[PDB]
Amino acid sequence: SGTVVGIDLGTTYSCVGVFKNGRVEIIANDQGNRITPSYVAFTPEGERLIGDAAKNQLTSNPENTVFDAKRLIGRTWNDPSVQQDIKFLPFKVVEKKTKPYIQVDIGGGQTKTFAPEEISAMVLTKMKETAEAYLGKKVTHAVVTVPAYFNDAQRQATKDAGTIAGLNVMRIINEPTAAAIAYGLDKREGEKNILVFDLGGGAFDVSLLTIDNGVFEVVATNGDTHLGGEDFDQRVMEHFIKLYKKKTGKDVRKDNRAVQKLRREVEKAKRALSSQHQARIEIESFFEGEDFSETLTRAKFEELNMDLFRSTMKPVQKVLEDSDLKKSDIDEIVLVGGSTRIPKIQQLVKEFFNGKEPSRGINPDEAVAYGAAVQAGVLSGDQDTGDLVLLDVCPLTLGIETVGGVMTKLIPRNTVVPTKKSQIFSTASDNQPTFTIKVYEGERPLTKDNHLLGTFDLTGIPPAPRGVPQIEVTFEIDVNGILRVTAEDKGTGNKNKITITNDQNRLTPEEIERMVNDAEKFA
Amino acid sequence: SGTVVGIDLGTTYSCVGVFKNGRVEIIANDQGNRITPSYVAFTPEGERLIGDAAKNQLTSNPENTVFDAKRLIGRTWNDPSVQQDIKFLPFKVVEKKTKPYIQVDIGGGQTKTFAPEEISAMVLTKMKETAEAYLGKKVTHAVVTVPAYFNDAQRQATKDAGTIAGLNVMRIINEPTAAAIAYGLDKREGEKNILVFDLGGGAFDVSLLTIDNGVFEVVATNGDTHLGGEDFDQRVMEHFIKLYKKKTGKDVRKDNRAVQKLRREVEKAKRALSSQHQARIEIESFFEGEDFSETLTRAKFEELNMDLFRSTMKPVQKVLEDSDLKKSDIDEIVLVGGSTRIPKIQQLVKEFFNGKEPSRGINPDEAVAYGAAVQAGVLSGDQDTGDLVLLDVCPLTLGIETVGGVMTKLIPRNTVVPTKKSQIFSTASDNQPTFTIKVYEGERPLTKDNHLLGTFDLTGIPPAPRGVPQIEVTFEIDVNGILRVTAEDKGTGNKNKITITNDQNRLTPEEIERMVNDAEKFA
């Protein structure tokens, strides 16, 4: 159905891929970013920001900047998860008819309430537009991913977000399953145990998947719903805000612009520290007159976060326990999320699994969208036409008995019918005057083990040395599937035949499959 | 449950049948009679008589001969029916704890009180013993019939009579319904109106039954609780007692033996007059020295009874009115009771219904027991074992799309699963390099109208003329109901497959029944 895209609708970031011309392409947005913040903002002037522009003004507009809608989507107001989450979300969440709604000022002082799926719809519209800019065609169809623990209400609300965004959501698939598909682990023969370690922007999900003869099962899930890359950013932000106040006496926290510039540089520093052992954070015109200039070492980054990093191992032990599996039972480790680039995190996981290397080759921020895009590729095949022709074929070899009780085939099994096949036969003895033609069905080399369909004689064979007379035996299957066997002395025109009908003495479909087992033993 | 008998527990006569070896047998008692008087008597010597022996000494022992217990059974003392009936019953009926009891001398001068159901128990014991003598086995189970107008108390008291007699009364069924069942009217398709005209020994019951798609309803009942064959006997008895006194001056009424012999001959005369137009009543040693010898014509029999005969039509008009039916609305007329053999009665009924013939073939005295015996036959099936095996079958045809958007089946609907089915397919075009296998579910001939389960390709088909390559497509449903579809080029071993799971995109039981409606349109 049309161009089908794969979308990772993430808690903090979303990512869109397309299977095009034999490859998955992860599509950069209009800012050149291959991931887009799951953020929506309303400015005082009534401007609607989605993605990077929404996230890069959160500090100055805390009330009318919406994020983490995925924490609320498909949930009731009195869900204890919702009651926890609203405590630290800076925008207003209210109950309407037992459901949570996000209340914002959309411009001037005009209050609106949005369903979580309406905020997610705006994020999915941005992902759709990103894909449309790249493809230069309208995108109408999508595969959208969700956490394995999402219930039916959460899956349907996610579908509804896509519908509102103008997408036919053909399938909702589990995030860890999408990541496994991205690495082609669905093409494994046998049973494989897959550990998906997904340390994202805002949440940590560990999933134990089994793949067994083409069937994926989510056996166990654990993690921490409030541990992610942004928490490591927060630890570094805290450090540098303290440090700046010590060194200048200036309190950065109440200045939205200063904070936003520091967050920005802190994120780039974190990425650099995945490639090298120190990063310079430099901000010209940082606070009042003065610049910012500090170095962050990897050691300091690790020290500020080591308790958070170490805590990621406990959920892994819990899914192994819940799955009743040993570390040695894990066939594949799949790393998902930006945070799995952190060398300390890679070390902790590898050490936990006694040196086992994880899967490599796909950007961990992009693996879920990649898998969704692969699955989208398969579903666009729904529009193709079946270019197969059914053949009518004879189900079992047909032949006659030759000297020694030998099955001599005239019509091989899987011959297209209707058909006519002939072979030349002769006498076994000098001046032999008669032939007995015994018609057999079956795959076995000796007719004692095949099914006798009928017999007839050819009499009055003129005298000749053995092997000299030429008798043509013809098997024909007509358009009605009736078998006629003719024997003709080519020297005289002397001829006899039998008509064999599917009336009496026909094998059962059971008996046929036992006989078909002995097909392809001899040519 | 064991040998189950059917018993008509009649006001004046009872009848027992058994369904044995494909036929109802109505069982003769030890006197050779297929009906037994509902009579119990206690002689001065303490002998207990039941049936024919009780009835054939009523004249000499009026106080300790009990009959018509069915008029009292399940009723309270102050029921106006009971207060009417005790006026002309010759045995003593008394109140104990608000219920009627029959008080008799059981021998010597020893007074006993019997519940009506205890008298009926003694009659049911005689019917049980009649059936046991015939079957040469103990009879433990029965179907017993009651008037349609019997209330719950009357039905339970009848059940209690059977329990006391050593019978498990499996079902109480209505007399007119039993008669309808005897004539197989329960096997009628559509709605039928049945008029049951039951002119018994002591009571006249008219019932309008509907049979509609296997359900019997008693719509309306009427009749005369005190009009029966014995009243026609009484009219003839009166005539001949007057006639004898005129001709001899002897008053027969006070001589029990003379009266009993006349009753006897009067009953046989009545039966004869249903077959011929005169009957001779001859009694040697009738009264004192002298014999009796008189002829009764049918004309005289009819004349003595014509007012009683004519009165049977009024209840018939009343049930038609109460049922809001026309004479032409009656589909079946069922005659029940000995008295319906009387030609005048048959004439009156046929004339009332403008020449419509009643049901024929069952003795009207035996039709109710016959119906009970049929119903008993069905209930003995309660002891049989279910010799059916549940099949696991595939609910909808499974197949692939062939050229033209054609549904080509691999697994027909109602195929037993697990299963594996194969067909051979080929190319539509010379040197075609690829197949697209589209897996469909449904009964419609074109796949646009069926449910798409999934697609996959088979690539790298070697060059050959169209129709030459042989690609085997296999559908297998495993023990878990998982569908796997394989396509294999038999020339190369090149193979691909899809696993289809009941996770996503599965039809609803609603959608399945709409599709099942189109099953069996094409083979």
Author numbering:
A (entry chain A), B (entry chain A): 27 to 549
What does the literature reporting this entry say, word for word?
Like typical Hsp70s, BiP consists of an N-terminal nucleotide binding domain (NBD) and C-terminal substrate binding domain (SBD) connected by a hydrophobic linker peptide. ATP hydrolysis to ADP causes domain undocking and closure of the SBD, leading to tight substrate binding.
The activity of BiP in the ER is subject to post-translational regulatory mechanisms, one of which is the transient sequestration of substrate-free BiP into inactive oligomeric assemblies. These homomeric BiP complexes are based on typical substrate interactions between the SBD of one protomer and the interdomain linker of another protomer. As a consequence, all BiP molecules of an oligomer are in a post-hydrolysis, domain-undocked state typical of ADP-bound or apo Hsp70s. Apart from the last molecule (C), which exposes a free linker, all other protomers are conformationally locked and therefore functionally inactive. The strong propensity of BiP to form oligomers and their architecture is further supported by structural data: despite being C-terminally truncated beyond helix A of the flexible SBD lid structure and containing a substrate binding-weakening V461F mutation, we obtained crystals of BiP in multi-component mixtures formed by substrate interactions between the SBD and the interdomain linker of adjacent molecules in the crystal lattice. Due to their characteristics, BiP oligomers are in direct competition with binding of unfolded substrates, which explains their disappearance during ER stress.
